[PDB]
Subunit: 458 residues, 3 copies
């Protein structure tokens, strides 16, 4: 009696799971929105910095109209390798943004010290890939927030460790691994040699220096006791346990709400795989919400949910889409896009400004939101699915994405727009205020920037 | 000198062979139509009963417009596992219908007793998959009929064993394996413990109870002597020998006639794989032909061929399609569909009724056809490719499919239609007769049913 | 710590490399056009002769409108096997044309003798595949020419060995391996038993007859010392080293210029794989350029580049495409096609004739081009990607392709066209001269042929 090979099955549920972290795939949340959960862990924020900045080059004539295809190929070649390192070291990739990613090792509180050592070694092996990247590490309390409606879901992680991992990675020169102050407090100081970072309490990792009897592979194996989903036994050859997910209509209904409809169309073999990689004209509306205390999920959770319900309603009317939601050092940020896969309708610009204003007015009156700031910028951006075969997400990358992000942070409390938007809108000039030029870290040649004042003086 | 791996090649001939049983793939029939062949074997009819009945749920809003995709994923997850069991135990899947399938073990007459034991063990392992299905078995003489024209072919199996395997499976409660009377007569009674089935000569299998020296794997190996196409030797790792078919234009011309054109388009990589899975509005015309003796191929074969030639001509004019032909307990049944893949033209309904009537009038005068009955029903049905990667077929599933089937059996001798068809047609009311309501085993809430009387009183 | 399998990655750069020989993939040429390089090697020209001639049959009704699909399946089944033999024996497939291919073993001059023995054994194993094909071999000096513009590149090999390998294969009856005179001069005469070929200095291989101590596998291993890209070590399981190419935007920009845009669309998953296999009406314009000395790259290179710049400009205006460039026994030949993938515009014929004439007038005044001859023929041709998964090219095959080729050689110095072109053009009759009928080796039933005289008497 024959025994044919049990082969890998790429069911639709597995294809959906590649877009999501274990944090969501293996969650089992209540239905209320917002939903909040509390835990401890180590976070790694890795950035292939400088990439977005150079992406303008893939529009150049030398790429012969295959710039998008070449960009996603070269980006994925490098990002995939980082992803695979994270996964083999037992981490969960939470989110991709631009040319950056955020990873989590969730563990019981008593094990933070040893897991920090695992994450440090991972980081150093990540740098080792590129000898021929900047990394920030944080550790401590983390909260999860899940928000959405009956057909869409989004998640965020929040708290001091999340705020920290950002600060840490901003400080890294190239090739550094930086630890947050709390990460450095909690870590196995006997193992790692560090330097001070001038005017900072964070530190830099110089070397990992294990004791005589130390064997990293045996240490790692011990650490796996505490990793719930590390592929093992019969499945030790897989990068993710999620590769083994079986059809389950209830679970697939829950997971599909996290993925955009155009991605699902691809998943369902109803659209060619190449259709979503493109260098496409869009308008970015980057919405930032600031709170008095952004580390307290129970305070900020309802407010984010309320803002989301309104944003999604305003976006719906124009086929805008939320591409991502991230925490920033200051606030919760919604990266919204007008002009995505087959959503290309006329007056994208006037509508984008009116949408922004509507969001601004509504969110300004939401209980607990202290400040709303919105940046609007328009031009050619890369859109595509970035990451590894087993862990990837649809992402937008471009100078206009980062300009919209920087505008909302450098011009808080108002709706701002770039010159393409201002000129294109053909709204009358007195709907705007021409703004002073600010030097914006990460940006140059911004062109004139404007505030969208609105239809009336007020 | 290198020796690179001989890799599996998915040639178009192999892709076509996945839609067909070994009975056809390895046949070598004459060109006459009808063609008839005679043999002996064991038949297994397996039904995941209740599924079709629940399929209405995949149209519900909770599935967020991916009902078809979720339905085919979950159905195939379960059906695939049954298919793989059948194939490993040496059976040939003949046909899929709805959430049911028919399998055959063809063997020389002297080996029926031992092959029944193999099929019994298979059936029990099939039930074992679902601890967390109903099976009927028959054995004896079987005839094959192949009918068609110069560009299309269809096959049927016929005879008392085929009639029996239906009766047997109708009697099974859930989780039963039922044997036909002849199967029970021919089987190894020392091996199997059975109960009587009240008011039936068929029996139910309680257990397989082998003797002391018995070793099922060694018994199975012996049985493989008699299985012409059991994958073996170098190919013992394959589910089907048909996976090894090589390009052969003559054979591919013959096999392609059994597959619908839209499936071939997919096979040829000229249509996306996802296009054929859909929850689509169609009109089912289910045609039943009854004979004085439906076990005699030489009598019924020419009549079925004659009926087929006319049906196919009438269907052609409106882009109706034959989806399947099955034997029923009473008669040969053609499952015809209007509105399939890209065949969506207006007045589907009036045309469907006129087509039905034309078929009714013509088939009624075919020598040897005793009664024609036709059921017409219209609404949302699932269409898609069901089964395993290596053995699958395009199938339609839905409450309207089963309503059309039950109408043709409970209202014999006339053309009947459902309320959607009647109301939609906007043919005048006196073209119809409103019918008494019958309780139809397998159905509820049918709505009013009508006879299509036709254009004249008569 | 897990170690998941390093799996084969089908990056876009690798997909592009399948369309190209190692000669180009691993080249590192200067940017000037023309570019010329000089080396030594053995050439194998293999033809599955008679195939093109029978291809008319795949339009017959018996193929039920899947003639193109069946043709490419059966052709690739056989061609793939030849390709795999060439690759395992260490050769580089340079080009596919019709049902023929050209392969090269490049080696240092001192090793020609031993490499000829390897190529002879390969050829005999190729014949061994088909017991149930004609091969010509040449050896000696070879020049490479690369020509093109800023966005397209083409290459040719040139010289006496290239002229020889053609002569050699023209002489082969079926099943022969013929050696050129120089190949026979350079080979290991102690190993091979040959016959004279009447009225020729080339010879035919009867047998390979190695000495007592000879072990072909050990001899082959020795020969691999001299094969730069033979897959080895960790990669000994691969057919080509090019399967291991990593993303490299500079290299991909260079390689993509050799591939047509519609093929790149497929590569990029932006068009279905099946779209390019078709039996399609086109017009072939086959352009032949003759030189006083076609073995001297430094003479003919600039002239071919000049002709190319003009051809490509004339083709551009009508969406004609260069499908291939080959050396012929006499001259350089450009196989140009009007009506390719989505390039189907009206008056294909008048435009094709005017294009031809423009090319004729311009190329006639290019320094060093002695004679220009152009054949124009129109009808149904097969287009598709022919070869192996790892080494394949887009090719056109058909009686009209070979008619255009034979016209340009049998009616040198003029633009000729077939009856379909002449009649279809509805240009006035005095734009043409009706030609005497020539018996053209490889052709019958040509229909009347015409010269395109042009708009004026002159
Ligand atoms: O029955 S429903 O389709 O409405 C359904 C609603 C749910 N709502 C929520 S929350 C969660 C699940 C769910 C259906 C599950 C199945 C539907 C069809 C199957 N068919 C087969 S073969 C098997 C399953 S199973 O997952 O229960 O095995
Ligand atoms: O590529 S694999 O089969 O290994 C695979 C592993 C995953 N592992 C996990 S967790 C998740 C997905 C996955 C395959 C994805 C696709 C494979 C073929 C497609 N053709 C089309 S359209 C589209 C997709 S899609 O999901 O990326 O859209
Ligand atoms: O653009 S980044 O790759 O740095 C990025 C990745 C994220 N996630 C992932 S995966 C989340 C946020 C994020 C960008 C953050 C900022 C963007 C603009 C700012 N302007 C000012 S002043 C400040 C910040 S901050 O949050 O870093 O303080
Ligand atoms: O020659 S025909 O295309 O008309 C033909 C008619 C048949 N009618 C019937 S019944 C059955 C087969 C058939 C053609 C077979 C081939 C056609 C092309 C091949 N080319 C190559 S390389 C090889 C074969 S083979 O199968 O004979 O090897
Ligand atoms: O999936 S496998 O390559 O193992 C395979 C085994 C079979 N074994 C046997 S017997 C038959 C078919 C088969 C593959 C089928 C497809 C693979 C990719 C496709 N892409 C598209 S459009 C479409 C098909 S199709 O044939 O299902 O249409
Ligand atoms: O619908 S089923 O899954 O039971 C089915 C599968 C088949 N094949 C496969 S694979 C072939 C037939 C078939 C349905 C048969 C009937 C459908 C309606 C009837 N109404 C009455 S009275 C009686 C029968 S019967 O033939 O079972 O007597
Ligand atoms: O920077 S450009 O895009 O203009 C460029 C021009 C060339 N012109 C020529 S000749 C050759 C290469 C080339 C760009 C190379 C890269 C572009 C983006 C990368 N991103 C990441 S992660 C990595 C590379 S790499 O190959 O240099 O590693
Ligand atoms: O098929 S393999 O993945 O082994 C492969 C090996 C190669 N080896 C080398 S060197 C080059 C290419 C190659 C795969 C090609 C494709 C695979 C899937 C496609 N789907 C679509 S559209 C399209 C292509 S394509 O490149 O042929 O267009
Ligand atoms: O058509 S073929 O398969 O023989 C062919 C394959 C090639 N390449 C590849 S891969 C390159 C050329 C080629 C055809 C050459 C000719 C075509 C028509 C001729 N008419 C006359 S007189 C003479 C020649 S010749 O060059 O063989 O003398």
């Amino acid at each position: 009696m024959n025994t044919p090979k049990e082969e890998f099955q790429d069911w639709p549920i597995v294809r959906i799971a590649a877009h999501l972290p274990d944090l969501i795939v293996y969650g089992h949340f209540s239905p209320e929105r917002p939903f909040m959960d509390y835990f401890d862990g180590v976070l790694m924020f890795v950035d292939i910095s400088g990439f977005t900045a150079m992406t303008e080059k893939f529009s150049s004539a030398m790429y012969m109209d295959r710039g998008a295809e070449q960009l996603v190929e070269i980006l994925n070649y490098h990002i995939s390798a980082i992803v695979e390192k994270v996964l083999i070291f037992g981490g969960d990739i939470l989110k991709f943004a631009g040319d950056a990613l955020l990873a989590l090792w969730r563990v019981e509180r008593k094990q933070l010290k040893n897991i920090i050592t695992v994450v440090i070694k991972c980081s150093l092996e990540i740098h080792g890939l590129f000898e021929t990247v900047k990394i920030g590490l944080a550790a401590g309390h983390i909260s999860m927030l899940v928000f959405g409606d009956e057909t869409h879901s989004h998640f965020l992680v929040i708290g001091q460790a999340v705020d920290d991992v950002r600060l840490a990675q901003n400080m890294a020169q190239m090739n550094d691994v930086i630890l947050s102050p709390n990460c450095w407090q909690l870590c196995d100081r006997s193992m790692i040699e560090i330097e001070s970072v001038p005017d900072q309490r964070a530190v830099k990792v110089n070397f990992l220096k294990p004791p005589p009897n130390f064997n990293f592979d045996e240490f790692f194996t011990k650490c796996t006791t505490f990793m719930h989903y590390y592929p093992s036994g019969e499945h030790k050859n897989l990068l993710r346990l999620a590769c083994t997910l079986k059809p389950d209509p209830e679970l697939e209904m829950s997971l599909q709400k996290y993925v955009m409809e155009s991605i699902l169309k691809q998943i369902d073999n109803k659209q060619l795989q190449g259709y979503l990689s493109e260098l496409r004209p869009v308008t970015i509306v980057f919405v930032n919400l600031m709170f008095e205390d952004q580390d307290k999920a129970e305070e900020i959770g309802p407010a984010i949910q309320d803002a989301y319900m309104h944003i999604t309603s305003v976006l719906k009317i124009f086929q805008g889409q939320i591409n991502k939601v991230f925490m920033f050092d200051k606030g919760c940020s919604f990266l919204c896009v007008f002009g995505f896969p087959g959503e290309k309708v006329p007056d994208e610009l006037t509508h984008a400004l009116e949408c922004a204003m509507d969001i601004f007015d509504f969110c300004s009156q939401v209980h607990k939101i202290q400040t709303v700031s919105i940046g609007v910028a328009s031009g050619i951006v890369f859109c595509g699915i970035v990451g590894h075969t087993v862990r990837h997400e649809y992402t937008v990358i471009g100078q206009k994405v980062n300009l919209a992000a920087r505008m909302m942070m450098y011009y808080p409390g108002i709706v701002t727009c770039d010159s393409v938007t201002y000129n294109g809108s053909n709204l009358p000039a007195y709907f705007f205020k021409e703004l002073p030029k600010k030097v914006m870290k990460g940006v140059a040649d911004s062109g004139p920037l404007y505030q969208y004042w609105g239809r009336t003086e007020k």
